[PDB]
Each structure stands twice: as structure tokens, then as C-alpha cells.
Amino acid sequence: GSPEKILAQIIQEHREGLDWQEAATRASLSLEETRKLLQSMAAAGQVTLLRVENDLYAISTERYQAWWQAVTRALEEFHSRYPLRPGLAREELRSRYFSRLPARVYQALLEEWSREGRLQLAANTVALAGFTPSFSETQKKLLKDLEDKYRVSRWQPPSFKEVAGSFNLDPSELEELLHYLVREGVLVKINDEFYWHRQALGEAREVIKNLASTGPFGLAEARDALGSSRKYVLPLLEYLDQVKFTRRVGDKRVVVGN
Ligand SMILES: [Y+2]
Ligand SMILES: [Y+2]
């Protein structure tokens, strides 16, 4: 039949879809003409075109929709089982549910769904865009007690090991809870050993603004204004240097952020 018909049949004869070249060759159409037909069929809603770099990959819209379904099932499961984690490792999601797809297509697929506002792509993890943690009452209490320990500690936060012992948790478990609290903005990571209650960090910065208001300051001066040991204050200052709140000028620091 006509090129449109021939091409449509070819696309249907490929469950996992096929790329631009394959389609053109099989339809005996030029690359240029194949693109034009693929582009129009896409605008018609009959086909879905994944833009894999400067290459094109065609799949039946029915199949594209089924793929989205495999993702929600995969994420629904991961999210319910690991409420504290941000998402499923990109690779795990790929090998477990999209092993039949070329890696490049899988990537373009995550991109499109991300651009449509369906997924949250952070680091190398994939999460449903509207992912809402569902904790058990025991998990909720631990998050509460955990946040309170840091809140009460103010500018003398307990170390990772200390908290680990107190609540008697394994390193793996505590890191997961703390990282979740960091994402919710309850805590801020100063370094691998120290996390600070966000509100406490805000007050500490105000202390630092007041300290700096009369001239550059050294570690010893920050130590006294915060009434906290250098053990907690140096890591704080290096963290503040990093987010550009403070700035080292010589052997002292000035405040260069709000
Ligand atoms: Y892209
Ligand atoms: Y110096």
C-alpha cells in the first residue's frame, strides 16, 4: 500500500519498537521521508517517538502506555517497601523491568516521563513524581525522636556513632533515616559525622552574622560565640564556607551570604 500504511504495519510488527534506520530500510523509504511520516503519525497520536539523541525510536502508543504501567508497579512496590529511600536505582529499574529495551531507549524513556512530570529523577534513582512516604507508627516515632535529639542538641549535635548507639540502630538503618530527614529539610548534613537540626543551623548562622558584624573572625571566636567545642564548630564553618555563607579571607572569615 502507501508508505504510511507500510510503515504503520512495520511499527506494529515490532513489540519493543524499532529505531529510525530499521524502519526506513524495511519500508524502502529514505531516512528523510521516514522521519516525515513518523513525525506526522506521532502528531496523530498513533505512534510515540522517543528522541534518542539525534536518532529516533518508534513504538506503538499502546506499548508506550504499557511501559508506563510497568514503572508504576515497580515504583509502587519499591516505595511501599522502602519509604525512607528516595527511589529505585536507575539500573535496577532497568534490568528488572526493561531488559528487553536498548539502554539508550530506556534512558530517553525516563527523560520523557520526567519531562511530563511523572517521575522524580535524582542521582541515579527513579521515583514517582507524587511519591508520598507511608510510614508505620513505629517509623513515625523514630523519625520524631530522631529529630528531637538533634533539635535539643542545638549547636552540639550528637555524632553519627553516638546516635547509632543511643537508639541502638545499625549504620545502614540510621543513615537511611537521617538522609530521609535531610530530604524533608529537618536536618542538614555538615559532614559524614555531623548532622544539624535545620532550625539550629539557622540560629547558628545568625550567631555568626552577629560575630562577623564587627570584623573578620577566627575559629576560637566562633567557638565562644556558639558556646560549642571546636569539634562541632570547625566542621560547621567549613560547611558554611561551602554554601558560601562564610568566606575565608586570610586566616579569618567574613560573612558573604544572607
Ligand atoms: Y534527550
Ligand atoms: Y595565613
Q: How far is the CA of 104 from the centre of ligand 1 (A)?
A: 10
Q: How far is the CA of 133 from the centre of ligand 2 (A)?
A: 49
Pick the CATH number of 1-60 from 1.10.3720.10, 3.10.20.30, 3.30.360.10, 1.10.10.10: 1.10.10.10
For residues 98 and 75, give the distance between their C-alpha atoms in angstroms, rounded to a whole number.
13
* 47 bridge partner residues: 60
Distance of CA 154 to the CA centre of its chain: 28
Are the beta carbons of 61 and 45 closer than 8 angstroms? Answer: yes
Q: Nominal resolution in Å?
A: 2.1
**Fold for domain 61-129?**
Arc Repressor Mutant, subunit A (1.10.10)
Counting ligands in written order, which one lies closest to the CA of residue 250?
A: 2
Radius of gyration for the alpha carbons in the chain, expressed in angstroms and rounded:
27
Are the beta carbons of 16 and 52 closer than 8 angstroms? Answer: no
Domain boundaries, the chain: 1-60, 61-129, 136-197, 198-257
Q: How far is the CA of 48 from the centre of ligand 1 (A)?
A: 15
> Is the CATH number 3.40.1280.10 carried by domain 198-257?
no
Structure-determination technique = X-ray
Distance of CA 163 to the CA centre of its chain: 26
Q: For residue 106, how many other CB atoms are within 10 A of its CB? A: 22
Q: How far is the CA of 108 from the centre of ligand 1 (A)?
A: 6
